[PDB]
Each structure stands twice: as C-alpha cells, then as structure tokens.
A paper describes a structure:
Membrane adenylyl cyclase AC8 is regulated by G proteins and calmodulin (CaM), mediating the crosstalk between the cAMP pathway and Ca2+ signalling. Membrane-integral adenylyl cyclases (ACs) catalyse the conversion of ATP into a universal second messenger, cyclic AMP (cAMP), and play a significant role in transmitting information from sensory cell surface receptors, including G protein-coupled receptors (GPCRs), to multiple effector proteins such as protein kinase A or cyclic nucleotide-gated ion channels. Membrane ACs (AC1-9) share a common structural blueprint: each is a polytopic membrane protein with twelve transmembrane helices and two catalytic domains, C1 and C2. AC8 is known to interact with and to be regulated by CaM, Gαs, Gβγ and forskolin.
To ensure that the observed conformation is not induced by the detergent micelle, we reconstituted AC8 in MSP1E3D1 nanodiscs with native brain polar lipids and prepared a cryo-EM sample using similar conditions. As the density of MANT-GTP was not well resolved in the detergent-purified structure, we replaced MANT-GTP with ATPαS. We reasoned that ATPαS should be a better substrate surrogate than the nucleotide-based inhibitor MANT-GTP since it is structurally similar to the substrate ATP. After multiple rounds of 2D and 3D classifications, the 3D reconstruction resulted in a 3.97 Å map of the AC8-Gαs complex and a 3.5 Å resolution structure after focused refinement of the AC8 catalytic domain-Gαs complex. The conformation of the nanodisc reconstituted AC8 is similar to the conformation observed in detergent. The N-terminus, C-terminus, C1b, and CaM remain unresolved. The density for ATPαS was also not well resolved in this structure. Together with the lack of a well-resolved density of MANT-GTP, these data are indicative of substrate and inhibitor conformational heterogeneity. One possible interpretation of this finding is that forskolin-binding favours a conformation of AC8 that is compatible with high turnover rate (i.e., binding of ATP, fast conversion of ATP to cAMP, followed by rapid release of the products), but not with high affinity binding of the nucleotide analogues to the active site. It is conceivable that neither MANT-GTP nor ATPαS accurately recapitulate the interaction of ATP with the active site of AC8. We have previously observed the substantial flexibility of the AC9 ATP-binding site that can accommodate MANT-GTP in different poses dependent on the presence of forskolin. It is thus possible that AC8 binding of forskolin produces a conformation that does not favour a well-defined and uniform nucleotide pose.
Author numbering:
A (entry chain B): 36 to 65, 88 to 325, 329 to 390
B (entry chain A): 361 to 394, 402 to 500, 504 to 584, 939 to 1051, 1058 to 1167
The structure:
Amino acid sequence: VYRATHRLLLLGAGESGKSTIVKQMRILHVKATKVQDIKNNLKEAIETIVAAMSNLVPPVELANPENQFRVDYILSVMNVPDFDFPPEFYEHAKALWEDEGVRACYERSNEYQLIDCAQYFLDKIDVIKQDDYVPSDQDLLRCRVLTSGIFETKFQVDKVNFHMFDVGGQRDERRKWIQCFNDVTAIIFVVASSSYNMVIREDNQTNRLQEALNLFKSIWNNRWLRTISVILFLNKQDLLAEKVLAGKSKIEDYFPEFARYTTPEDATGEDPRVTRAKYFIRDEFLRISTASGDGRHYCYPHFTCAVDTENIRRVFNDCRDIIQRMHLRQ
Amino acid sequence: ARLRLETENQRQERLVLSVLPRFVVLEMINDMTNHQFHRIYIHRYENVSILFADVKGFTNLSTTLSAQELVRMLNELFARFDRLAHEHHCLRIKILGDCYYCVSGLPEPRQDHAHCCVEMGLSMIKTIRYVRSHDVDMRIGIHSGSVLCGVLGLRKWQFDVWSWDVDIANKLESGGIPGRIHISKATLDCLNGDYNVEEGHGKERNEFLRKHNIINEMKELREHNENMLRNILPSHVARHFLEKDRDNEELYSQSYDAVGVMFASIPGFADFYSQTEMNNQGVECLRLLNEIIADFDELLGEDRFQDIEKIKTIGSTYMAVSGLSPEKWGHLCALADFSLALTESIQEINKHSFNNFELRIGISHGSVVAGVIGAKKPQYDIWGKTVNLASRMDSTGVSGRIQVPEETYLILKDQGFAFDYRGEIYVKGISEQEGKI
Ligand SMILES: Nc1nc2c(ncn2[C@@H]2O[C@H](COP(=O)(O)OP(=O)(O)OP(O)(O)=S)[C@@H](O)[C@H]2O)c(=O)[nH]1
Ligand SMILES: C=C[C@@]1(C)CC(=O)[C@]2(O)[C@@]3(C)[C@@H](O)CCC(C)(C)[C@@H]3[C@H](O)[C@H](OC(C)=O)[C@@]2(C)O1
Ligand SMILES: [Mg+2]
C-alpha cells in the first residue's frame, strides 16, 4: 500500500507559510507552550519595532517624551533573552503601540525584518494582559514559529492516506531537502506573495521573493525531480491585497516588468491591481516552469491563504483531485 | 554443445560470485533482463560487527625493501588473512593500502564476533613471527552496530558498507595500541560479560562523541554473465582468472616504469551525512554519493581518457593509475585532464544540490608494481613508494586545489611553488596545479 499513501512535500523560502498551511489543514480535518509561543511572538514583535525605531537609517520621531522611559526599558530588556511576562511591561507596550511614532515605524517596517503577524498580535495585547483566555483557531494560525528539521504529518481524507512533508526554508536547511527527494507523489510549492517587498534575513540584500523564485527555478529544473509535476500554493495573498490597496509600495519597486505587464484573460468585490499582481506572480512561476518544461512535470497554480479556511478547503479540494488523478499515473 | 556451454557458464558465474554476494547480484541480474535517481543496491542491516586492520610500521618497511618483495610478503600474509577469515564466517570487504576490514553476519544474522577477535590475535602473532624470520605491528578496531550494504558506481563495482557505526570502528582502529583490541561497549554488551577486558584506552583519539572505549537460454545467461564480468574486473586479469592457474600461482604481478598515480577526495561529505529518522538511515545521502561516483565513472568512459584505469573508491576517494597498459608523457596530461574534469563534475553536482563539496587532488609519478593480491577474491591493486607518496600528497593537501610532483611538462601552466610541505619521507617544495592557463 505504498502508492496508496499520497506523500507530498512543500518547498519554499523562509517564512513562506508552509508550517501555517500544515497547521490550518490539520485543524480543518485530521496548551501552555502554545500560549507561551503567543507571548514570545508578541515580545519579539514589539522588541524589533522599538529597536528599529532608532536603528533605522532615516530617524523617526516619537509621539511623546514620557514614553522615552518605556523605550529605555525595552532597550534594556532587548539583549535579555529571559522569559519575563510582567503586566507592567504589557502596559508599557500598550502605551508604545498607541504612539504615532511606533505605528509609523510599523508602516516603515519594510526597511528591516519583522514577523508578519505583528500587527494582528499588536491588537491582542489587551486580552493577552489577562493571560487566561483560551486561544482561538485564528489565534493558533497566527502564531509564529521557526522550522529547521523536516517534519512529517499524517493525513486522512476520503478514506485514503496522505502525508505532509514540511521542510525549512533557510539556506542552512536547503541542504536537507535531498533527504526527501525520492518517491514523493507531488510537490506543493508555497511562496509568500506579500513578501515580494521584503528581503531575506540570511543575507540582508536579496529579496525574499527573488530568492524564492530562484529556488523554484532550481527545484523545477532539478535533474532528479522531473516527473513529479509541482503544484503551486502561493500563500500570503490577503496581506498582498491589503498592501497593494494601501498604495505605499508596489511591485514596480522591484519588478518594473509588472509596470509593463497587463492583466491576463483568466480573471476570476475586487480591484485590477491586486488581481494582476497575483496573476503576474503565477505567470512568472509558469514562465519559469514552461521555459524549463520537459513534457513530464506540469504546474497547476492555485492561490492560497493559510489564515483563511474556505479558501484553504477549496484549493485543497482542487489539489486533492489533482493528486488523485496523478496517483494513477495517467 | 549444451553440456560444454553449461559448464563454461557455471565457471563464469562462480568467478563473479567470488565477489558481490548473491542477494545483490540477483537484483542486478534481474535488472539486466528488464528512474528519477541513478538506482542503488543498498540494504539496511542490523547486528553487524566490524573488524579493522592497519600496519603501523608500513613507513618503516616500504623504504627498506623494494616493491616486489614487499608485495610477496603482503600477498602471503593476506592469503593467510583471507583463508583464516573465511574459516570464521567473516568476509573481506576491501583492501586499501594496508587496511583490511570485514563484517559479521551481513547476508544473514550472526553474532559471537569475539572468536574472530582471538583469531585475529593468533593471525597477527603468526605474521610477526613470519616477518621476524622490521616493525609490522597492527591495531585492532572492532565496533558493533547497523550498516548499509551495497555497491556504487558504473565501473569496477565492489562490495562496500556505509554507516556511522563503521566510522566508529575506523576511529577505534585509528586509535592505536598495536597488538591490542578496541572492544568498546557496543561489543561488550553484545558478546558477554565473562570475557576479561581492561578499562580501555586512556586518551589517544580526539575526545569527540564519547566513543566509550571500554541452448539459446543458456547463451542468453552467458551473455549477461559476460557483461557483468566486463563491468567488474579488468580484461586480461579476468581472462587469466577464467581458466586454470587461479590458485597454483598465488601472486600475479608485474612492475612498470613510467607510471602515474592520482588520488582525489571529498572531505566535506562527512558533514552532509546524517542518520535521522526521516531519511531512512541516511539512504538518501548514500544515494547522493552514488550519484557523484556514477558521474565520475561516466566521465571516465569517454574517449578522451583511454590510458587511465579506475582502480578503487575509498569512501568518497577516487584512485586512478596511468601507464599500466602500454598501447612520451601525454598520459600524465590525460591524468591532469582527469583531475580537472573531476573538479568541474563535483562543482556541477554542487550546483545541482544545495550544499558545498570540494576535491583534494594528489598526483605522483614513478615506477609501480601492479597485480592481484587475493586469489580467492580478485582484487587488482598497486604498490610502491610512489603509491604512498601520492597518498600523502593527497592527505597533506588543500581542498579545491591540485598538488603536483616535480614538473615534467609545460603544456598547461601551474602555480604555487612555495609550499615546502614536510611530508612523511622528507621535506619537498614543489608547486601546485591549476587549470590550463
Ligand atoms: N495574515 C496572514 N498571516 C499569515 C498568512 N499565512 C501565514 N501567516 C502567518 O505568517 C507566519 C509565518 O508562517 P510559517 O508557517 O511559520 O512560515 P514558514 O515558511 O513555515 O517559515 P520557515 O520555516 O520557512 S522559516 C505564521 O505565523 C502565520 O500565522 C496569511 O495568509 N495571512
Ligand atoms: C561515506 C561514508 C562515510 C561518511 C562514513 C564511512 O563509513 C566511511 O565511508 C568509511 C569510514 C567506511 O567506508 C570505511 C572505509 C573508509 C575508507 C575508512 C571510509 C572513509 O573514512 C569515509 O570517509 C572519507 C570520506 O574518507 C567514511 C568515513 O565516510
Ligand atoms: Mg516553517
């Protein structure tokens, strides 16, 4: 029954949402440390905000001098990795978040590296002050954690067995992927879309999306993975939509071919720019696929949002039909 | 005609089955009668025990007597080695320089490896007694664990075993205390507690990982077997081994004058190896290694390198000789091209994978003695001073760069005169080797 187990793996750059998509799929159908992770994600988010408040090359003003004491407090607790969760510091962080300077720094967070969930996590401070509420499914899927070792997850659907292979995206872990390049039914490629504007934290020069696209070119053209027909799940679509609707940043900041690009004919409340952005990233992946196509691997782009559920289930149903087709070796 | 064909086919099959045990040769022969990866014949095995040997005084005897007599004594000692080993349910894996290792119960489960330990003690005392009639002392390293067995490459396949346990055994033998065994806990817990053993080594090896040293159908079958012969052993040696005079003449040898030797190594592979729970037991790592070696062999067969003959592969180390078959110094140019092509091949497989691998290359020139050292198992081999000179030039080299002996050519430029490495025989300052220009 080796074939009957549809084993498939996700490959992509760091913070592309693969672990989140695994968690969302798991809760869609098949603790104290989790709450700790919520708190720690909040801590690092606010820490990075206030560190880049001053470390940023263009200085940003502070709303009120009275919060300079809290800024010094957070600077003192910056180098400290101790797991401190005092209500006083929660009140301090609440005071900072209502300052216009901190909000402006968050809006200017595109210059440095910051976790994506921060904003949402920055609205959970009032209820995380109590530290007693049970986290919701949205809260669980908003949690941020790193993945280094490759992970396998059981799966069952329509009375058949699937296997999830979630691997790391950091360059240090890119050597481990060959450990699972064999006998895999399909590849579920996941690339963070809204992270087009970010850059990698491994080098601090190259864009996260550019690095992801180069990794996709490597994976698709790999001389050992030529009969597996990768399936594309571009995550991060909701943040991409809100970012383009914001208007502060656009794809032309990094890819003027988008400015030359025009909307395709396969368009599906909406706006032209967001639709053509998602379609353009899909079309760039498809261009890399077809230009390196060999007649055996086929790319089926499908737009995904990990935090969403209806989108998750719809795209997962489409992909499950695709995997059911490919299983028979048509 | 049918009887004659059956007899000759049986003889040829037995010549193969001298090496390459049944459980893998069956899979190969099944594959010949009719893939995202190059395919590999490794199977996991448990409850295996690894012995090791190494002449500690080979540097104290290689210089004294010539290569021919040294080969004579090495052949007689290794013939005793192999016979006494086959007496005690032990099968040689390979012979490399002076090293010699065997496993316990690989084709089928078996234990009681201490019998082979006392057997090794008796054999070693016999060898030293024969030699006295020069320091030829040797160290015993035995470790128990689980291994992966199989063959790699598309030319000169040999039975080989890879694991972390065999690495521990290699380190145990490399420890020292000649004439005494390394009987680390993995063997004490397995064998028994009634055996009298000491406290173990004080400190000789690097304190790392805490080793705790304490008619048409018959014709088709004949064609398949002939193909496998041609893919295992050299043509003339295979012809000599097919007919009589396999055992009547113990040593088959010949000395050659204008010979070159090349060694290449991949030090970083020990980095990439990892025996976790997801990748079965590192089988994917050995798949990558088999891909590398297959690329090297596929590069070998091309028309641009005809006078170079692959001999053996020690781990990720490639040994290739030149001048053995005379049919001028263009063959050393061919060896240099071989090294350059190997470097480009490993860089290509670097870029195809997602890690970094580098090659250490050492070339030497001189006169060698080439022959077969094992009558029961056909293992073509080389010996001589230049052999260990090349081995040291490879081991005492810098990764990603090619080291060269005294310059005897000018076609493609070299660089790096100021090395003056101490070596092991004497100090010798000779340049290094880059590409064509
Ligand atoms: N708002 C929003 N947040 C998302 C979305 N997708 C993922 N996230 C959040 O982004 C974070 C990063 O996801 P994660 O799964 O950790 O990336 P990763 O690729 O596994 O990280 P790595 O191991 O490669 S470094 C998660 O905490 C998740 O909550 C999304 O579509 N919308
Ligand atoms: C590829 C396998 C791996 C990682 C582990 C292993 O068992 C080895 O193959 C042995 C020990 C093993 O094959 C026994 C022979 C010999 C020649 C001692 C090998 C080399 O030491 C290899 O190291 C090299 C690369 O020289 C090494 C150690 O590398
Ligand atoms: Mg992850």
